Amino acid sequence: NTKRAVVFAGDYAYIRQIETAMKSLCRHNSHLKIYLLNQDIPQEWFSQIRIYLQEMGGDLIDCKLIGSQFHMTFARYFIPDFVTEDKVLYLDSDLIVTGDLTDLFELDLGENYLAAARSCFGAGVGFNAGVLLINNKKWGSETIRQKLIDLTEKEHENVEEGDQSILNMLFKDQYSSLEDQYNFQIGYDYGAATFKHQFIFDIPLEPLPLILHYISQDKPWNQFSVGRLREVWWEYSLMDWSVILNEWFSKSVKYPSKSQIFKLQCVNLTNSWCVEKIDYLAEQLPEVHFHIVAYTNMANELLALTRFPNVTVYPNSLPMLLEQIVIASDLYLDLNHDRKLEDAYEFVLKYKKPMIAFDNTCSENLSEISYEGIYPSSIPKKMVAAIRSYMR
Amino acid sequence: KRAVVFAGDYAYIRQIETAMKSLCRHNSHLKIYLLNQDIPQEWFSQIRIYLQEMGGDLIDCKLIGSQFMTFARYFIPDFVTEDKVLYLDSDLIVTGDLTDLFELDLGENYLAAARSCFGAGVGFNAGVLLINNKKWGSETIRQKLIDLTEKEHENVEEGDQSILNMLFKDQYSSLEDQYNFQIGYDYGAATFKHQFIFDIPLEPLPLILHYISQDKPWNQFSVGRLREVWWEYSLMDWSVILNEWFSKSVKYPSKSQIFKLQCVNLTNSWCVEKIDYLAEQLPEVHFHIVAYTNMANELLALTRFPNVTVYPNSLPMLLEQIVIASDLYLDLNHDRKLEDAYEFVLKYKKPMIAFDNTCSENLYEGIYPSSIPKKMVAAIRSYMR
Ligand SMILES: O=c1ccn([C@@H]2O[C@H](COP(=O)(O)OP(=O)(O)O)[C@@H](O)[C@H]2O)c(=O)[nH]1
Ligand SMILES: O=c1ccn([C@@H]2O[C@H](COP(=O)(O)OP(=O)(O)O)[C@@H](O)[C@H]2O)c(=O)[nH]1
Ligand SMILES: [Mn+2]
Ligand SMILES: [Mn+2]
């Protein structure tokens, strides 16, 4: 069985909507490789949900939009910067999946950049951007991300529907059509009643369309709403993940969780952005939990480390808090480049913690043999091996 | 049933539900009141089922009206009927059995509370309060808290907490630190250099963990300890909590029902005759109250009922679909009647009943005494099956 690639985009403030949309998707579709573009979603949320996805034969990818090369609704531009599959389904998070999307996953795009449903049953112009079957390979080569940004830079003050207006203005005459049921814009109800489009309300709702899109500001999760099918959103919002997993498990669709308990706890205190080879070490040592502490604001280079499931980053901490982390750690990593904060060494000595360093990060005021080991920064494989020697 | 009260808004729903989960995980047969203005009824309907299966209940306390962050706890005696009640903040975690706290005799004290930050602060922390509600009610404490808050709210450093301390100085009993272990003080302690705070054992876990301050464990980043315990409960499924109790001979059937009738009314007025009474009397009926504009508080407060849906700023076509789906039109609105309703009622051959004082002055299967609305209750049940 092969994985089907799906991408959502949203901030932590929208977590209840993102999670509800994912729950509805996973309820009816297994083997999903889900990418989630975000800036501020907590790592703990990703860790747990990732286990669910894996147990259902899929995975969950934390795509952190942290850095200058990068919300609101514009994050879908950066899709080909994260997704490795040649085809992927983008979904808004103000929507609900009600059934098997196999036919949608398997649609052949040909030379079309994407496939999409029309806007509001044909009331609007062009396609609705909330459901996009995307030719990711083509998006990569045609440099679509830069083209959307550049075009949105012009004429964002000249368009009625933002990113959607931009997507239609770039892509017209080169997209495939999806049936309305794959992006059924039930959120248009207020609009339809406004413009007196009586026949919109004669469109059958039994059985439920495969994808329900609650467009507009009349969201069913608000205290009050006026559009139809409000009850469907709540049905999935209030659904335990256990219900979803139990349905798949009861049909023998069960895969082992790939999560593992940590075998070692490492700590470093930095005041600078550059912790030597930290990204590489994190990548190579998923079974080590790294704790990177600072007493001040942190640069994007360090904040972006949240994309790893095994790095905890503590900006704006204080000496008493660092001390407790040191006591709890197995090994100090002297990897920071600027002037050393001595008391960390004091904590290290006091609590009898081993400490290792790179050739270019060892203190100028310390003797070599004060470290358990000093390893070459241009061959960090050697420190990887060094770190693993502390485990058992 | 032990009475517990939380207070918070919909924006804080992730924290409220986590706190409740942690509470229910370790304590059964709880009557939970939740003071709020904007939490959706769907959330209440589902969580109420869980509380009932565990031998308790969930009460929606809607603070909707002129007489109404962080200051909702003043209104506790207006909603809570029990003589004693435990108020809890929503930025906290219950890690065990709270029986010794529930069973604490207050005597003549207005409340029991733990000291602020292990003694670092002044007076008590207001995030955990065992309240003598009978006394708060009889001595009109809510009014006094409001009045004291009118003055002095800008002379104080800790808001509602400072006011509660100011009113109840020398008239409260003490709780041990573990019933309000303010682990969220970690950043503060580290800031003011209170070194010995960090020597206090965290194992065994204190019965109540309180994440005070802006350093919340649910944020993307935080620096205080025990961050992982909050996430353990936030990510815990309700099925797990229910199974724990089911496994321990605690299991009751849900008191939920399905609606046997759908009724609808279109209104241009705040006054919909006897709608509060009808909703209360007919839980098996789902009432739909529609308006084309914003709605008065009298109508928005109907959200406290599990069987009334209110539709402010709706439109004729939207109303039409509701009317089509309805079994019976209730012409209960005072003042100007809107003809869209009569149009649809005619079109879709819908029955329509009224009170003797809400008939249109321009035209029913029945017209009932507005002074004995019980007759209408009997009549509404006559359309069912
Ligand atoms: O507060 C917000 C609002 C928007 N979104 C994201 O931006 C998308 C566009 O928002 P919306 O769906 O409301 O636009 P519409 O579908 O009405 O055109 C959403 O699906 C979310 O993924 C978000 O993450 N946080
Ligand atoms: O955005 C908010 C902030 C606060 N609260 C409520 O107000 C209480 C007091 O806030 P907090 O607990 O954060 O203050 P502290 O405990 O640090 O004094 C919380 O428990 C919540 O119940 C809320 O409902 N929404
Ligand atoms: Mn959308
Ligand atoms: Mn609190």
Render A207-264 in DSSP notation, one character per residue: SPPSEEE--SS--TTSSS--SS-HHHHHHHHT--HHHHHHHHHTTT----------SE
Nearest beta carbon to residue A193 from set B191, B193, B317: B317
**Rg over CA atoms, chain A:** 25
How far does the centroid of ligand 4 lie from the alpha carbon of residue B127, in Å? Answer: 5
> Tokens 């879908």 label which residue?
A76
Instruction: Please state, as a whole number, how many other Cβ atoms lie within 10 Å of the Cβ of residue B214.
Output: 8
Residues A149, A276 within the same domain: no
> Tokens 């979904």 label which residue?
A91
Q: Report the C-alpha gap between A120 and A135 in whole angstroms.
A: 23
Considering every ligand atom shown, identify the ligand nearest to the alpha carbon of residue A128 and give its number.
1
Q: Report the C-alpha gap between A37 and A307 in whole angstroms.
A: 11
Do A226 and B311 count as a contact with CB atoms less than 8 A apart?
yes
Q: Does B214 touch chain A (CB under 8 A)?
A: no
Among chain B residues, the shortest Cα distance to A298 is held by: B221
Q: Does B123 touch chain A (CB under 8 A)?
A: no
Q: Is the CB–ligand 1 distance for residue A238 below 6 Å?
A: no
Three-state DSSP class for residue B316 = helix
Q: Report the C-alpha gap between A25 and A100 in whole angstroms.
A: 8
Three-state DSSP class for residue B237 = coil
Contact A334, A269 (CB under 8 A): no
Cα-based distances in Å from B379 to B277, B302, B326, B361: 14, 22, 16, 22
Give the nearest ligand 2 atom to B89 CA. 20
Q: Does B108 touch chain A (CB under 8 A)?
A: no
User: For chain B, what is the domain count?
Assistant: 2
The structure was resolved experimentally with: X-ray
- Which secondary structure element, helix H or strand E, spans residue A267, and what is its range? strand A264-269
Q: Report the C-alpha gap between A208 and A375 in whole angstroms.
A: 61
Q: Report the C-alpha gap between A242 and A254 in whole angstroms.
A: 13
Residue A116: φ, ψ to 5°:
-155, 160
Give the nearest ligand 2 atom to B184 CA. 17
Burial call B53-88: b when 16+ CB within 10 Å, e when fewer: bbebbbbbbbbbeeeeeeebbbbbbebbebebbbbb
Q: Is the CB–ligand 2 distance for residue B69 below 6 Å?
A: yes
**Rg over CA atoms, chain B:** 24
Among chain A residues, the shortest Cα distance to B325 is held by: A228
Q: Is the CB–ligand 2 distance for residue B217 below 6 Å?
A: no
Residues B283, B195 within the same domain: no
Q: Does B322 touch chain A (CB under 8 A)?
A: no
Q: What is the maximum span of chain B, computed from C-alpha positions, in angstroms?
A: 80
Q: Does A249 touch chain B (CB under 8 A)?
A: no
Among chain A residues, the shortest Cα distance to B39 is held by: A223
Contact A94, A216 (CB under 8 A): no
Chain pair A-B, CB pairs under 8 angstroms:
95
Cα-based distances in Å from A98 to A24, A26, A207, A211, A230: 6, 10, 10, 6, 14
Give the nearest ligand 2 atom to B88 CA. 20
Pairing of strands A4-9, A32-38: parallel
Nearest beta carbon to residue A321 from set B13, B223, B313: B223
Q: Give B170: exposed, middle or buried? Use CB within 10 Å, 0-12, 13-18, 19+.
A: exposed
Among chain A residues, the shortest Cα distance to B188 is held by: A318
Residues A65, A21 within the same domain: yes
- The answer for A 12-31 residues in CB contact with B (under 8 A) is 12, 15-16
Q: Report the C-alpha gap between B92 and B246 in whole angstroms.
A: 25
Residues A9, A105 within the same domain: yes
**B33's tokens:** 């009141």
Q: Give A265: exposed, middle or buried? Use CB within 10 Å, 0-12, 13-18, 19+.
A: middle
Residues B217, B275 within the same domain: no
Choose one of B253, B279, B300: the last residue of a domain: B253
Q: Is the CB–ligand 2 distance for residue B162 below 6 Å?
A: no
Give A330-363 as a DSSP string. Answer: SEEEE-B-SS--HHHHHHHHHTT--EEEETTTS-
Instruction: Please state, as a whole number, how many other Cβ atoms lie within 10 Å of the Cβ of residue A379.
Output: 11
Q: Please report, as a single letter, which amino acid is at residue B309.
A: T
In angstroms, this model's resolution equals 2.0
Our separate counts of H helices and E strands in chain B read: 15, 15
Contact B279, B353 (CB under 8 A): no
Residues A147, A275 within the same domain: no
Q: Which residues, 6+ apart, have CB-to-CB distance to B141 below 8 Å?
A: B74, B77, B110, B135, B167
Residues A250, A262 within the same domain: no
Nearest CA to ligand 2 atom 12: B91
Contacts of the segment B251-256: beta carbons below 8 A, 24+ positions apart: B251/B53, B252/B52, B252/B53, B252/B54, B252/B55, B253/B52, B253/B53, B254/B49, B254/B52, B254/B53, B255/B52, B256/B45, B256/B48, B256/B49, B256/B52
Does the N-terminal peptide bond of residue B283 adopt cis geometry, omega within 30 degrees of 0? no
Nearest beta carbon to residue B189 from set A227, A230, A320: A320
How far does the centroid of ligand 3 lie from the alpha carbon of residue B279, in Å? Answer: 35
Q: Report the C-alpha gap between B159 and A105 in whole angstroms.
A: 55
**B105's tokens:** 């005799």
Burial call A191-214: b when 16+ CB within 10 Å, e when fewer: bbbeeebeebbeeeeeebbbbbbb
Residues B288, B354 within the same domain: yes
Q: Which residue in A44, A50, A186, A247 has the most chain B C-beta atoms within 10 A of its own C-beta, making it the best mutation to test that interface?
A: A44
Length of chain A: 392
Residues A140, A274 within the same domain: no
- Which secondary structure element, helix H or strand E, spans residue B196, and what is its range? none
Chain A CB contacts of B318 below 8 Å: 189-190, 193, 226-227
How far does the centroid of ligand 3 lie from the alpha carbon of residue A80, in Å? Answer: 20
Give the nearest ligand 1 atom to A73 CA. 7
Residue B195: φ, ψ to 5°:
-65, -30
Residues A74, A1 within the same domain: yes
Instruction: Please state, as a whole number, how many other Cβ atoms lie within 10 Å of the Cβ of residue A109.
Output: 18
Q: Is the CB–ligand 2 distance for residue B9 below 6 Å?
A: yes
Our CA dihedral for A20, A23, A24, A26, rounded to 10 degrees, sits at 160
Pairing of strands A95-97, A211-213: antiparallel
Look up the domain containing A263 and give its range: 257-392
Q: Give A16: exposed, middle or buried? Use CB within 10 Å, 0-12, 13-18, 19+.
A: middle
Nearest beta carbon to residue A42 from set B218, B225, B320: B218
Instruction: Please state, as a whole number, how many other Cβ atoms lie within 10 Å of the Cβ of residue A155.
Output: 11
**B271's tokens:** 């006054």
Report the residue numbers after which chain B has a gap, meaning the C atom sits over 2.5 angstroms from the next written residue's N, or none: 68, 363
Mutate to test the pocket of ligand 2, among B87, B89, B164 (most ligand atoms within 8 A of CB): B89
**A379's tokens:** 């061959």
Nearest CA to ligand 1 atom 10: A73
Q: Report the C-alpha gap between A213 and A201 in whole angstroms.
A: 15
How far does the centroid of ligand 2 lie from the alpha carbon of residue A304, in Å? Answer: 29
How far does the centroid of ligand 1 lie from the alpha carbon of residue A184, in Å? Answer: 16
**B301's tokens:** 């407060």
Our separate counts of H helices and E strands in chain A read: 14, 15
- The answer for B 65-94 residues in CB contact with A (under 8 A) is none
Chain A CB contacts of B306 below 8 Å: none
Pairing of strands A175-177, A114-116: parallel
Three-state DSSP class for residue B337 = coil
Nearest CA to ligand 2 atom 16: B212
Residues B270, B189 within the same domain: no
Do B223 and A317 count as a contact with CB atoms less than 8 A apart?
yes
Q: Does A297 touch chain B (CB under 8 A)?
A: no
Do A313 and B221 count as a contact with CB atoms less than 8 A apart?
yes
Dihedral of alpha carbons A124, A129, A135, A138, sign: positive
Q: Helices B41-53 and A230-237 sit at what angle, rounded to 10 degrees?
A: 40
Report the residue numbers after which chain A has a gap, meaning the C atom sits over 2.5 angstroms from the next written residue's N, or none: 70
Residues B258, B247 within the same domain: no
How far does the centroid of ligand 1 lie from the alpha carbon of residue A77, in Å? Answer: 14
Which strands, in side-by-side order, build the sheet including B328-331? B308-311, B285-290, B261-266, B328-331, B352-355, B366-368
Contact B264, B322 (CB under 8 A): yes
How far does the centroid of ligand 1 lie from the alpha carbon of residue A73, in Å? Answer: 6
Three-state DSSP class for residue B174 = strand
CA–CA min distance B51, chain A (Å) = 14
CA neighbor of A323 nearest in space, from A296, A344, A297, A299? A344
Choose one of A256, A275, A307: the last residue of a domain: A256
Give the nearest ligand 1 atom to A161 CA. 18
Chain-centroid distance of CA A267 in Å reads 25
CA neighbor of B51 nearest in space, from B78, B33, B76, B70? B33
Q: Does A238 touch chain B (CB under 8 A)?
A: yes
Choose one of A206, A229, A256: the last residue of a domain: A256
